[PDB]
Amino acid sequence: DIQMTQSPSSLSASVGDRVTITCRASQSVSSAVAWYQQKPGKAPKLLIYSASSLYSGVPSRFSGSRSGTDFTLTISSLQPEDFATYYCQQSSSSLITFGQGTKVEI
Amino acid sequence: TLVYTGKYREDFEIEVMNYSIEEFREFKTTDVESVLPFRDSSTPTWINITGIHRTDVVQRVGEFFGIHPLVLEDILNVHQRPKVEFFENYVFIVLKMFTYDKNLHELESEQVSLILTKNCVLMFQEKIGDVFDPVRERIRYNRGIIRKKRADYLLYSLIDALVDDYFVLLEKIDDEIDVLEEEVLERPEKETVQRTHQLKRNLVELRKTIWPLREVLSSLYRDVPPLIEKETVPYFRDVYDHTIQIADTVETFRDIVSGLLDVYLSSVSNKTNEVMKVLTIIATIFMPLTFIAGIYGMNFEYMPELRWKWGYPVVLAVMGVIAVIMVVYFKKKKW
Amino acid sequence: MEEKRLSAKKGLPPGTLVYTGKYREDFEIEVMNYSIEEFREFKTTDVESVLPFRDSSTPTWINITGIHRTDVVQRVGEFFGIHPLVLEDILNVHQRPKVEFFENYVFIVLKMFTYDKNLHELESEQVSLILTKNCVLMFQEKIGDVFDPVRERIRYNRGIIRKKRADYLLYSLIDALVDDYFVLLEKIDDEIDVLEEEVLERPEKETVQRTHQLKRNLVELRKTIWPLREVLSSLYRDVPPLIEKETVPYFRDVYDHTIQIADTVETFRDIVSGLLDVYLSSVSNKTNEVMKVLTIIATIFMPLTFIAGIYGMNFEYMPELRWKWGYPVVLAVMGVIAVIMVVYFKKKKWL
Amino acid sequence: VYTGKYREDFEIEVMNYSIEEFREFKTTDVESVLPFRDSSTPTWINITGIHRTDVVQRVGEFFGIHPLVLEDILNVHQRPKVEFFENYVFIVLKMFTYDKNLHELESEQVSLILTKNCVLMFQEKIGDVFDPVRERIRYNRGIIRKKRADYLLYSLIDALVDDYFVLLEKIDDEIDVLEEEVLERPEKETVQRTHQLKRNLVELRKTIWPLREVLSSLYRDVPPLIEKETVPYFRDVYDHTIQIADTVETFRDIVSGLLDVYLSSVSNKTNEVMKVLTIIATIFMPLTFIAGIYGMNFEYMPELRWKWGYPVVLAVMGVIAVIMVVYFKKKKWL
Amino acid sequence: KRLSAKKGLPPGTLVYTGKYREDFEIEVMNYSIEEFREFKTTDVESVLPFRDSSTPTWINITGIHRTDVVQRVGEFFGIHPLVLEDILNVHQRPKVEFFENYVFIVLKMFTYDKNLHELESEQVSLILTKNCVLMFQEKIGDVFDPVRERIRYNRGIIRKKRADYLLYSLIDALVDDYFVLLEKIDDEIDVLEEEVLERPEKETVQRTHQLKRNLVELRKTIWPLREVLSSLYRDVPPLIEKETVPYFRDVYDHTIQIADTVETFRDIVSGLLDVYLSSVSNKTNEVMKVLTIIATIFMPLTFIAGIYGMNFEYMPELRWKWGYPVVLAVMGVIAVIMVVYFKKKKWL
Ligand SMILES: [Mg+2]
Ligand SMILES: [Mg+2]
Ligand SMILES: [Mg+2]
DSSP string, B104-136: TTEEEEEEEEEEEETTEEEEEESSS--S-HHHH
Q: Is the peptide bond before E81 cis (omega within 30 degrees of 0)?
A: no
What is the Cα–Cα distance from C27 to C140, expressed in whole angstroms? 9
The angle subtended at Cα E149 by Cα E146 and Cα E150, nearest 5°, is: 80
* DSSP assignment string, E248-283: HHHHHHHHHHHHHHHHHHHHHHHHHHHHHHHHHHHH
Using alpha carbons, select from B18, B10, B12 the residue that is nearest to residue B31: B12
Q: Distance between alpha carbon C123 and the CA centroid of its chain, in Å? A: 7
What is the Cα–Cα distance from B293 to E311, expressed in whole angstroms? 13
What is the Cα–Cα distance from D261 to D258, expressed in whole angstroms? 5
Q: Distance between alpha carbon C274 and the CA centroid of its chain, in Å? A: 18
CA distances C39 to C43, C46, C159, C172, C228, Å, are 13, 20, 15, 17, 31
Return all residues near C205 (Cβ < 8 A) that are at least 6 apart. B267, B270
Is D282 in Cβ contact with B278 (below 8 Å)?
yes
CB-side neighbour CA atoms (13 Å) of E193 = 15
Using the Cβ of A24 and the Cβ atoms of chain B, whether some distance falls under 8 Å is answered with no
What is the Cα–Cα distance from C225 to D303, expressed in whole angstroms? 80
CA distances D204 to B133, D207, D247, D302, Å, are 48, 5, 11, 81
Report yes or no on chains A and D touching (3+ CB pairs under 8 A).
no
Cα distance from E132 to chain D (closest Cα, Å)? Answer: 30
Indicate the residue of A56, A93, A94 with minimum beta-carbon distance to C25: A56
Q: Distance between alpha carbon B68 and the CA centroid of its chain, in Å? A: 32
**Count of CB atoms within 10 A of residue B328's CB?**
9
Q: Residue A29's domain is classified under what CATH number?
A: 2.60.40.10
What is the Cα–Cα distance from C130 to C25, expressed in whole angstroms? 24
Report yes or no on chains E and A touching (3+ CB pairs under 8 A).
no
What is the Cα–Cα distance from C126 to C92, expressed in whole angstroms? 9
Q: Which residues of C touch D246 (CB under 8 A)?
A: 226
Cα distance from D126 to chain C (closest Cα, Å)? Answer: 33
Cα distance from A53 to chain C (closest Cα, Å)? Answer: 9
Q: Which residues of B touch D271 (CB under 8 A)?
A: 268, 271-272, 275
Instruction: Confirm if D143 and D133 have CB atoms less than 8 A apart.
Output: no
* DSSP assignment string, B68-81: -HHHHHHHH--S--
Radius of gyration of chain C, Cα coordinates, nearest whole angstrom: 35
What is the Cα–Cα distance from D217 to B14, expressed in whole angstroms? 60
Say what angle helices B69-76 and B55-65 make with each other, to 10 degrees: 150
3 state DSSP class of D119: strand
What is the Cα–Cα distance from A54 to A47, expressed in whole angstroms? 6
Using alpha carbons, select from C307, C136, A11 the residue that is nearest to residue B295: C307
Instruction: Confirm if A102 and A37 have CB atoms less than 8 A apart.
Output: no
Cα distance from D38 to chain C (closest Cα, Å)? Answer: 35
Instruction: Confirm if D191 and D262 have CB atoms less than 8 A apart.
Output: yes
Residue D332 CA to ligand 1 center (angstroms) comes to: 29
All partners of chain E with 3 or more CB pairs under 8 angstroms: D
What is the Cα–Cα distance from E91 to E17, expressed in whole angstroms? 7
What is the Cα–Cα distance from B4 to D188, expressed in whole angstroms? 38
All partners of chain B with 3 or more CB pairs under 8 angstroms: A, C, D
- A66-100 CB burial, b ≥16 within 10 A, e <16: beebebbbebeebeeebbbbbbbbbbbeeeebebe
**CB-count exposure of residue E250 (10 Å: 0-12, 13-18, 19+):** middle
What is the span of the domain harbouring residue A64?
A: 5-106
Q: Which helix (H) or strand (E) holds E177?
A: helix E164-198
Q: Which residues of A touch B171 (CB under 8 A)?
A: 27-30, 92
**Count of CB atoms within 10 A of residue E103's CB?**
20
Closest-approach residue (CA) in chain A for B170: A30
Instruction: Confirm if B136 and B158 have CB atoms less than 8 A apart.
Output: no
Count of domains in chain A?
1
Is B172 in Cβ contact with A68 (below 8 Å)?
no
Resolution (A): 3.3
Q: How many residues are there in chain E?
A: 348
- In degrees and rounded to multiples of 5, residue C319 shows phi and psi of -80, 10
> What 8-state DSSP symbol labels residue C279?
H
Is E296 in Cβ contact with D191 (below 8 Å)?
no
- In degrees and rounded to multiples of 5, residue E26 shows phi and psi of -125, 130
CB-side neighbour CA atoms (13 Å) of C47 = 18
- A17-53 CB burial, b ≥16 within 10 A, e <16: eebebbbebebbbbbebbbbbeeeeeebeebbbbbee
Q: Which residues of E touch D281 (CB under 8 A)?
A: 295, 299
Three-state SS sequence of B7-52 = CCCCCCCEEEEEECCCCEEEEEECCHHHHHHHHCCCCCEEEEECCC
- Determine the residue among B185, B186, B273 to mutate to test chain C binding: the one whose Cβ has the most chain C Cβ atoms within 10 Å: B273
Chain C, chain D: beta-carbon pairs less than 8 Å apart: 10
> What 8-state DSSP symbol labels residue A29?
-
What is the Cα–Cα distance from A39 to C193, expressed in whole angstroms? 54
Closest-approach residue (CA) in chain C for D296: C312
Instruction: Confirm if C36 and C159 have CB atoms less than 8 A apart.
Output: no
Is E306 in Cβ contact with D310 (below 8 Å)?
no
* DSSP assignment string, E4-40: PP-SSS-SS-----SS--S--EEEEEE--SS--EEEE
- D218-227 CB burial, b ≥16 within 10 A, e <16: bbeebeebbe
What is the Cα–Cα distance from B266 to E244, expressed in whole angstroms? 56
Q: Which residues of C touch D263 (CB under 8 A)?
A: 280
